[PDB]
Design a binder for these strands. Structure first.
Ligand SMILES: [Ca+2]
Length: 78
DNA sequence: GCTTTTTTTTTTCACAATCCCGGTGCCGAGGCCGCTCAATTGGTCGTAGACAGCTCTAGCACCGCTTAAACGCACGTACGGAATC
């Protein structure tokens, strides 16, 4: 029953939930949609990718396709 | 989830065009022939260039500063392209 309060992971729950029920939000896609006056100028997104894989493992996130040329990971309903 | 609607299918039917065949007939690809001139045979005679030996050109290697240009990095404007009509 430990409430964890992440930083960049909080940043991706708004970047995942900004689009709804159709599987269209990728690491490459999210990084260009989220890069607005806060984050590390360069290689901030490597931690974006670490945040997303750990978010998948909590159970909040799922995937249909991912990495390379195309992807999509979105919030599996609680 | 449930009707109650659009949206996108699939299906079914009639029709146009193309496709494949054998039948037919015409002519040019193919080969033969008989001749001829260009390739071959064997010859002389000259030098183009292969090769050895030497010169010394200029390409390579290396080095030590002095910036100028490349890098990367942040930021956001005007650009590309999706949408509409
Ligand atoms: Ca000869």
């Amino acid at each position: 029953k430990s409430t964890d309060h992440p930083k960049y992971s909080d940043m991706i729950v708004a970047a995942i939930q900004a689009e709804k029920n159709r599987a269209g939000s990728s690491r490459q896609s999210i990084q260009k949609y989220i890069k607005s006056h806060y984050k590390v100028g360069e290689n901030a997104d490597s931690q974006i990718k670490l945040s997303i894989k750990r978010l998948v493992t909590t159970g909040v996130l799922k995937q249909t396709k991912g990495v390379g040329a195309s992807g999509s990971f979105r919030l599996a309903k609680s």
